[PDB]
Design a protein around this ligand. Structure first.
Ligand SMILES: Cc1cc(CCCCCCCOc2ccc(C3=N[C@@H](C)CO3)cc2)on1
Lengths: 40, 59, 273, 255, 59, 40, 57, 255
């Protein structure tokens, strides 16, 4: 129950439960498959 | 003895046989690990569990 | 539910009262196996003997004390009780300890209540309301050195601020590293020849630091902190023999030497009533 | 014609027969079983030597005399040197096991005496010094020899006072632990099956013992007239469902 | 760093040995990295020993 | 009504109403019937 | 959720542990690519490492 | 992008990667497998330690120099002391095993040299004395050290003449045995998978070795100018599908 009118006044947000490290761990242009050779 | 780019480099000697290249314990919150991003984040938490990935790139 | 059924005379070849205790069992014998009984009902459920109930009331687990005074020229705040600290533990006081050690492994959430009362020993004037700050300093995190260190910023560490005379209350989930807390541990932290034996090594749960936020007034004020602990959501495994001798140390089973006989000697014979 | 009385336990390449048993106890009514995945944490596949480790090792014999106070063995310690069980033990980082314990003591229908055979999960001993003196490692790792409660206090060792179970509790209440009596007049063996009991799924076998087996004379031995005044007691123990994990170099332990 | 809780050691040795081509000399180096597997869990947040201060900063 | 998000913050648990002493009172391997002889 | 799957001996032409870090990627290698593993579950969600939680006290 | 050239073998808790392989040989085109019942004789259930024995042990390294004649190891001897493999070995009456052998030797594109890596089932050695002099036990059980064909004749030892394979046959014909070459210009490792080969279903691991692994320089090592004149050769071997049976007291063997 929100007792207040504005959105800033609500409690903390709830877990992204998004999670996708590939923008950080695999930003390569041509896709690399694990097990296939790195450099062909 | 002072922080240097050189403490990132593990040296290798030609022609040695049987011998040891480096050694370290695995206290990820201390020692070599401590300044790494992993080490640095682990330190915001009290407990850790899981597998670590250690890789070596040859130059 | 019947507490006793009706049972009459017996002249059998089937004797429920003769057993062999060497087997390790306690055979479930009842009044009606050996006298003639009448029906009676239980009228009772055994509600208040549930382990949740047994371990579920607040017990005093710790009394410490800190003072508000001018720190000017104090070389060791910790030592002046400018801010004490407590190595969280649950065996320092014994009423609750004997209760928990009836079990080997125990798992529960904790609810802490902290009462803080002030005392002014040296004849005084006006007492300005002191606000206590209770920090959780788990192991690996900077521990306070002065009563007003950067540590107290506590940007990542849960801390509660309440007023002396009031009470603070919050609840911490089961923070054990394993599946249960060991009430006992017949091991070492490693195969060292001189390492300590016991649970002390398993008890690590860090410490909790208290301080007054107020600067000093002209008089000195003693604040004494009492921490109460209530187990909620209790789970207990493997019952053990109750503690008979007195305790000597947090975390070891050791009893004092030249202790006194714990079994009351008869005033009379074996035959005496 | 089956009696509670006669029994055969075959485990590995070894068999035990008793013609004068008094049933058998299975701790907490649970039988040893391997470690399920749902309970697993370490990702390593474990090693299950099976029949080469799950057989019966008979420890060296004790001698019950009228002055005996009782003996205490710790597990897995007592077996630290038995065959391949022991090797596996020193060579893996973690291991887990249940046991069948068979304690033997026969006499004649003229003797009297009664031993308590009990298994205590997590038996943390007390220092006889009091205060917060610790009990050094070696002292709680007697090996197959076990601890002799009628031996003298030593320094860094545990207290050996029987009315207090070596920990501040009374002998009389040990009966809350899985146990069985050997009453010369009834019984000649005691058998207890121990499931693995711990707060972690698998542990170190050298830094932590998870049960102490204790044999304590309670009704003193009384031999017939002009009989030799003593009887030997033998303990045979078999690891069961053993699993080892995290193999490597081979632990080095104090002393 | 907890004992009971300790994780092991990591070492590295020559299996055969480093061999340099002709006209080449000296030491060669390995770079080493660390990251966590997807396996990893961290819990119970707390304050880092890696940063502290003695007076508030100003502009 | 729970006012709080985490489970640790809820009140005491409610009676097991489990109760089974046989793991403690009768941990024997072969079942003993009351009335039948203890040792056969 | 499985934290590790069961995996046994390998003798392949397909080597997941050899990579080229010069590329800038961190290849997602797991225990089961280089030792024999058993199944285990995560039992964990990563709740307390959410940025809302990290900056939210 | 799979090449015959790069390979990974993971066995137990140990992994090997080669980026310069030349395929791999599987003796007689058969892969190690356990002992089927139809072939069994001993009635004992066997013990299969699995991952604790089926991992890779790297023996101590050798040094190929221009004067090297070749080295010879016997199996299971070479592993008689490796971890739990070895313990099992001394503790059971009978055992059986296949192996993965990985021989390693890297150089540069200026070196030349070529080693023959061959596995000989039942390699009965000859006495250098001639006549019917025997080859004493110790001499055919060198352990991890193996036999160094350029060492001197010793008394009671085997002959170490390379053009004769240590038995009266010519080096040139060793190619009829499963083998692989390491030619610095091509190759940097050799890998052979050995199935268990015997005339009995299971045998003693101490009185009979069932294969000798032999590494022999054939085209002499030639290093680039002013290079150090030698290269190390390393042998790593992993028992696979190992089974032990008839556990007991623990063999005591000469010397
Ligand atoms: C502000 C503020 C202060 C705190 C404290 C957090 C609670 C942490 C304490 C965790 C529970 O501590 C223990 C310690 C020991 C045992 C225990 N020892 C054995 C005899 C049995 O149980 C159980 C819980 O949190 N926020």
């Amino acid at each position: 129950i929100n007792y207040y009118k504005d959105a800033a006044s609500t409690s903390s947000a709830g877990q992204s439960l998004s999670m996708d490290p590939s923008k950080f761990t695999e930003p390569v242009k041509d896709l690399m498959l694990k097990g296939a050779p790195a450099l062909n | 003895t002072k922080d240097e780019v050189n403490s990132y480099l593990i040296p290798l000697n030609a022609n040695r046989q049987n011998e040891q290249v480096f050694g370290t314990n695995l206290f990820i919150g201390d020692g070599v690990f401590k300044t790494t991003l992993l080490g640095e984040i682990v330190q915001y938490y009290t407990h850790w569990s899981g597998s670590l990935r250690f890789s070596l790139m040859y130059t | 539910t019947v507490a006793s059924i009706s049972s009459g005379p017996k002249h059998t070849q089937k004797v429920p009262i003769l057993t062999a205790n060497e087997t390790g069992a306690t055979m479930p014998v009842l009044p009606s196996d050996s006298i003639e009984t009448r029906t009676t009902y239980m009228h009772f459920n055994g509600s208040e003997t549930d382990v949740e109930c047994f371990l579920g009331r607040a017990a005093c687990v710790h009394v410490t004390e800190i003072q508000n005074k001018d720190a000017t020229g104090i070389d060791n705040h910790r030592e002046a009780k400018l801010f004490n600290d407590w190595k969280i533990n649950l065996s320092s006081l014994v009423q609750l300890r004997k209760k928990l050690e009836l079990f080997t492994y125990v798992r529960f959430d904790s609810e802490y209540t902290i009462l803080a009362t002030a005392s002014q020993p040296d004849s005084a004037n006006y007492s300005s309301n002191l606000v206590v700050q209770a920090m959780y300093v788990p192991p690996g995190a900077p521990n306070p050195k002065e009563w007003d260190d950067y540590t107290w910023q506590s940007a990542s560490n849960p801390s509660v601020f309440f007023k002396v005379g009031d009470t603070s209350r919050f609840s911490v989930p089961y923070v054990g590293l394993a599946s249960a807390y060991n009430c006992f541990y017949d091991g070492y932290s490693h195969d060292d020849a001189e390492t300590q034996y016991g649970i002390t090594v398993l008890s690590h749960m860090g410490s909790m630091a208290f301080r007054i936020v107020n600067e000093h007034d002209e008089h000195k004020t003693l604040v004494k902190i009492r921490v109460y602990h209530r187990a909620k959501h209790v789970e207990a495994w493997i019952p053990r023999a109750p503690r008979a001798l007195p305790y000597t140390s947090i975390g070891r089973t050791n009893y004092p030497k030249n202790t006194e006989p714990v079994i009351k000697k008869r005033k009379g014979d074996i035959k005496s009533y | 014609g089956y009696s509670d009385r006669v029994q055969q336990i075959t485990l590995g390449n070894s068999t035990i027969t008793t013609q004068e048993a008094a049933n058998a106890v299975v701790c907490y009514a649970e039988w040893p079983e391997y470690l399920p995945d749902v309970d697993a944490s370490d990702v390593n596949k474990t090693s299950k030597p099976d029949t080469s480790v799950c057989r019966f090792y008979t420890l060296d014999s004790k001698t019950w005399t009228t002055g005996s106070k009782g003996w205490c063995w710790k597990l897995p310690d007592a077996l630290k040197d038995m065959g391949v069980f022991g090797q596996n033990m020193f060579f893996h980082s973690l291991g887990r096991s249940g046991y069948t314990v068979h304690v033997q003591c026969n006499a004649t229908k003229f003797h009297s005496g009664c031993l308590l055979v009990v298994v205590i999960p997590e038996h943390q001993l007390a220092s006889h010094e009091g205060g917060n003196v610790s009990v050094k490692y070696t002292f709680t790792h007697p090996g197959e020899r076990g601890i002799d409660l009628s031996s003298a206090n030593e320094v860094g060792g545990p207290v050996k006072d029987v009315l207090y179970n070596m920990n501040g509790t009374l002998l009389g209440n040990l009966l809350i632990f899985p146990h069985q009596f050997i009453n010369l007049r009834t019984n000649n063996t005691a058998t207890i099956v121990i499931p693995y009991i711990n707060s972690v799924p698998i542990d170190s076998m050298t830094r932590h013992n998870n049960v102490s087996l204790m044999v304590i004379p309670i009704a003193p031995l009384t031999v017939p007239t002009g009989a030799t005044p003593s009887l030997p007691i033998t303990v045979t123990i078999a690891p069961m469902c053993t699993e080892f994990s995290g193999i490597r170099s081979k632990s080095i332990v104090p002393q | 760093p907890d004992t009971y809780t300790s994780a092991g050691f990591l070492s590295c040795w020559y299996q055969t040995s480093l061999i340099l081509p002709p006209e080449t000399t000296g030491q060669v180096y390995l770079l080493s990295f660390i990251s966590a597997c997807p396996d990893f869990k961290l819990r119970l947040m707390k304050d880092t020993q890696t940063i502290s201060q003695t007076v508030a900063l100003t502009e």
